[PDB]
Amino acid sequence: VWVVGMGIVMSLIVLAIVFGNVLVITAIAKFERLQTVTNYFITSLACADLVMGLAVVPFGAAHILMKMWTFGNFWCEFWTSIDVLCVTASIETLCVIAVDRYFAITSPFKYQSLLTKNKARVIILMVWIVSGLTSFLPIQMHWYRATHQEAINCYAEETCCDFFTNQAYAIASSIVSFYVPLVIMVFVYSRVFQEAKRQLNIFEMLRIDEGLRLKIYKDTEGYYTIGIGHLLTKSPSLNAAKSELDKAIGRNTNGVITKDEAEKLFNQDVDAAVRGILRNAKLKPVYDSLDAVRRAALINMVFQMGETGVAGFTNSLRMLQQKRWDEAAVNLAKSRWYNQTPNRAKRVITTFRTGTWDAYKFCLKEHKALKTLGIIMGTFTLCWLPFFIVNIVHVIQDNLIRKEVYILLNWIGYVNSGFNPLIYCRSPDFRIAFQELLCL
Numbered sequence: 001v002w003v004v005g006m007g008i009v010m011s012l013i014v015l016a017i018v019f020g021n022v023l024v025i026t027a028i029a030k031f032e033r034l035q036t037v038t039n040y041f042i043t044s045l046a047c048a049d050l051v052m053g054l055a056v057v058p059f060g061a062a063h064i065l066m067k068m069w070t071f072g073n074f075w076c077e078f079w080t081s082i083d084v085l086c087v088t089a090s091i092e093t094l095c096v097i098a099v100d101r102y103f104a105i106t107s108p109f110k111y112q113s114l115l116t117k118n119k120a121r122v123i124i125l126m127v128w129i130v131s132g133l134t135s136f137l138p139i140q141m142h143w144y145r146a147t148h149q150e151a152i153n154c155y156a157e158e159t160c161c162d163f164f165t166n167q168a169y170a171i172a173s174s175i176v177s178f179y180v181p182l183v184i185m186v187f188v189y190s191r192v193f194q195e196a197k198r199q200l201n202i203f204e205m206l207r208i209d210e211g212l213r214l215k216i217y218k219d220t221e222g223y224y225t226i227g228i229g230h231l232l233t234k235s236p237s238l239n240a241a242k243s244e245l246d247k248a249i250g251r252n253t254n255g256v257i258t259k260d261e262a263e264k265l266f267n268q269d270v271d272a273a274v275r276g277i278l279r280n281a282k283l284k285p286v287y288d289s290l291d292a293v294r295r296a297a298l299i300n301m302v303f304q305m306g307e308t309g310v311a312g313f314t315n316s317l318r319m320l321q322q323k324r325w326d327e328a329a330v331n332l333a334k335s336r337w338y339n340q341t342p343n344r345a346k347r348v349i350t351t352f353r354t355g356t357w358d359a360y361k362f363c364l365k366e367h368k369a370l371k372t373l374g375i376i377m378g379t380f381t382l383c384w385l386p387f388f389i390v391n392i393v394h395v396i397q398d399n400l401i402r403k404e405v406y407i408l409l410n411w412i413g414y415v416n417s418g419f420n421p422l423i424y425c426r427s428p429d430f431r432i433a434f435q436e437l438l439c440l
């Protein structure tokens with residue numbers, strides 16, 4: 001019959017869950033630079049998805065294909081109990097991630113978790129402990145058992161593992177175990193995206209569109225530069241750029257420098273840009289007649305071109321001081337600066353034009369890491385929220401739920417366990433880690 005199709009489909013889903021989440025787990029286990037605090041949370045998140053694929057989805061596939069329960073009422077309890085455990089531990093983990101990323105993005109240690117690894121391990125156990133209590137106890141203590149005849153006949157029957165619960169459980173379980181951490185997750189992590197966008201200074205602005213290299217390279221004009229767009233010299237001699245590099249650093253570098261002494265150059269360059277805007281009489285009044293977002297966009301222009309080069313935009317300077325943003329943005333486009341480097345000028349002109357950071361959304365490496373964590377959360381919501389909204393309406397509407405429409409929406413939740421590894425292939429560090437494990 002037509003069951004052979006779903007068997008292959010479900011068997012592939014079990015593989016994509018197991019093979020993908022063991023891949024995520026092993027990548028964090030062996031590789032050091034992925035052993036971060038956030039990735040310990042992802043480890044337990046992958047475990048919740050891995051156990052979903054080893055203990056839950058297969059026995060649910062045998063339940064659908066055989067149209068009955070082969071494994072007894074004992075395993076019917078654990079299968080249900082472990083299924084609830086993996087979903088409860090997943091949302092709280094995603095809830096801990098969001099709160100961890102909030103306290104990180106608000107501390108002066110931006111993008112770095114305040115929790116230590118030993119303490120984050122203490123959090124993981126409590127999540128599984130609290131999940132293990134809210135999941136096993138209501139199922140093992142029969143607090144879910146309904147009192148209507150159809151449920152009672154399935155309870156005593158060992159070949160039936162239909163999941164009928166009384167209305168009190170369906171409410172309290174959905175609220176405490178799913179909706180509360182969901183609402184916290186969505187509110188706390190929307191608070192993170194709002195801080196990353198609000199907390200964009202000139203330093204992150206430049207470091208995005210200027211880049212960072214630790215080896216001497218030629219810039220867009222061909223001049224020897226190093227660090228974050230630090231101009232070394234305009235002479236074609238490499239040692240002239242290396243000797244000027246050593247005079248500025250004080251160390252014999254042979255053209256290679258660390259990230260610490262590269263930020264120190266980056267600070268001095270930005271300081272020279274602000275001091276240069278204040279020395280020049282043509283740039284001083286315009287800088288003062290600007291908000292912090294456009295002050296940065298101005299510091300960026302002086303960073304790239306110098307004080308005298310930026311002062312040539314005599315019309316654009318008068319308009320940015322007259323606060324005529326759209327009109328200044330046009331003369332900024334009619335320049336040869338927008339010709340040589342259009343992608344950078346676009347982001348700077350739009351920063352003047354709009355007075356926001358929309359041109360630099362998710363352009364910084366650490367913001368892309370947050371957007372990655374926002375996708376595993378938004379996916380977790382879209383996979384389970386339909387299931388949980390139908391449970392909450394099923395109870396209120398008082399009509400019993402359609403067994404195929406019910407189990408359907410639970411499988412949209414099941415296929416969530418295979419989505420996390422692909423969203424991690426959207427990180428550059430996991431791609432490099434996965435390719436080693438796959439030996440590609």
Ligand SMILES: CC(C)CCC[C@@H](C)[C@H]1CC[C@H]2[C@@H]3CC=C4C[C@@H](O)CC[C@]4(C)[C@H]3CC[C@]12C
Nearest residue numbers: 040043044047048051055082085121124125128
């Ligand atoms: C099958 C079900 C019922 C039991 C599985 C739950 C337990 C054994 C598993 C699932 C996820 C696991 C955690 C995943 C994250 C790691 C981080 C690592 O640095 C230390 C151990 C720690 C913190 C694990 C401890 C044990 C753990 C909580």
Ligand SMILES: CC(C)CCC[C@@H](C)[C@H]1CC[C@H]2[C@@H]3CC=C4C[C@@H](O)CC[C@]4(C)[C@H]3CC[C@]12C
Nearest residue numbers: 025026028029043047050051052054055056082
């Ligand atoms: C009934 C069946 C499904 C229960 C078996 C649950 C299995 C999958 C659980 C139980 C304990 C878990 C492990 C606990 C220790 C951690 C160490 C961490 O650095 C990598 C993941 C790893 C190794 C976990 C992987 C998943 C794990 C092995």
Ligand SMILES: Nc1nc(Nc2ccccc2)nc2ccc(Br)cc12
Nearest residue numbers: 092095096099176177178180181184
């Ligand atoms: N499911 C639940 N998760 C979590 N995690 C969490 C951890 C740190 C900060 C915020 C939230 N908290 C809950 C508080 C009450 C109730 Br009720 C349920 C939860």
Ligand SMILES: C=CCc1ccccc1OC[C@@H](O)CNC(C)C
Nearest residue numbers: 080083084087088163170173174177
């Ligand atoms: C109304 C209970 C639904 C629920 C609440 C909390 C955690 C998980 C929940 O349901 C997960 C489903 O995957 C289980 N459905 C059965 C076990 C097939």
